[PDB]
């Protein structure tokens, strides 16, 4: 089938879970999936723990990433390194789905060029589906997306 | 950019020229193009003569193709051989545009499986543009196409 781009944005909770839920279904179906998490959690990775043993490549941002204004050079460089993996995936004809978790902040803080993104998305293997997660998704990215679900928080605990 | 699928259909004259005109522009721009002509002309190939020396691969149906009812087996086999080239092109990340001239008759006479077509189109490299020419284009193909121009014959000589 033709791979599409899906975006899970908005301020509501479940963006990441949605993306991992899709991935889970894909794997359950025998598809090849690759994952990039631009934001390293200070906890244990349930999703990774689950999926990884199933041949799902995982790429997580380095611990060293600081988000500090005076560290833009180093942080940009760490983001670039992790995104290299992402571009590679976005170039793999054998990967049925690619997950770019928390990609929106990387763009929103200018740690990665939107243009590289657009380009990478555009040139991907036709059967490839890509899932983008994160609050405040860049409009240009939304314009390119096939599906956009906005998690609106009706209530939050 | 994102490669699209363009269809030049209808009964008006210029379907092929349109497709070659697009190809000419692409080459003029430095793009890589590949061509498949499902129908062998009994004349000299102006387009081929022109484009070929520019590194444009050309794939023409074998002379042996008959269109004869009692030769479906052999003709199907010749079509399949030529289409193998087409699928290959439709799989090349380095080809910016692929031209499938007179592809509509191959589908319309069942010499090539529409399903193989849809599939090949769907899985192509994201930056790839494909041009399909021919009268009576299968609807399913039209549904998948980004642009569809129908050559309506207002007058004919
Ligand atoms: Cl979540
Ligand atoms: Cl013509």
Curated annotation (Swiss-Prot), chains A, B:
GO cellular component: cytoplasm
Cysteine pairings via disulfide bonds: none
Biological-process GO terms, alphabetical: cobalamin biosynthetic process; porphyrin-containing compound biosynthetic process
UniProt entry tagged with the keyword Metal-binding: no
Catalytic activity reported: 2 cob(II)yrinate a,c diamide + reduced [electron-transfer flavoprotein] + 2 ATP = 2 adenosylcob(III)yrinate a,c-diamide + 2 triphosphate + oxidized [electron-transfer flavoprotein] + 3 H(+); 2 cob(II)alamin + reduced [electron-transfer flavoprotein] + 2 ATP = 2 adenosylcob(III)alamin + 2 triphosphate + oxidized [electron-transfer flavoprotein] + 3 H(+)
EC number, as in UniProt: 2.5.1.17
Protein name per the record: Corrinoid adenosyltransferase CobA
Record-level Gene Ontology MF annotations: ATP binding; corrinoid adenosyltransferase activity
Subunit-structure text: Homodimer.
Family: Belongs to the Cob(I)alamin adenosyltransferase family.
Keyword Transferase annotated: yes
Record note on disruption phenotype: Mild growth defect on 1,2-propanediol-cyanocobalamin medium; no growth is seen in a double cobA-pduO deletion.
Residues of the full protein shown: 27 to 183 of 196
Major site of localization recorded for this protein: cytoplasm
Binding residues for ATP: 10-16
Keywords from the named record: ATP-binding, Cobalamin biosynthesis, Cytoplasm, Nucleotide-binding, Porphyrin biosynthesis, Transferase
Protein origin, superkingdom: Bacteria
Function: Required for both de novo synthesis of the corrin ring for the assimilation of exogenous corrinoids. Participates in the adenosylation of a variety of incomplete and complete corrinoids.
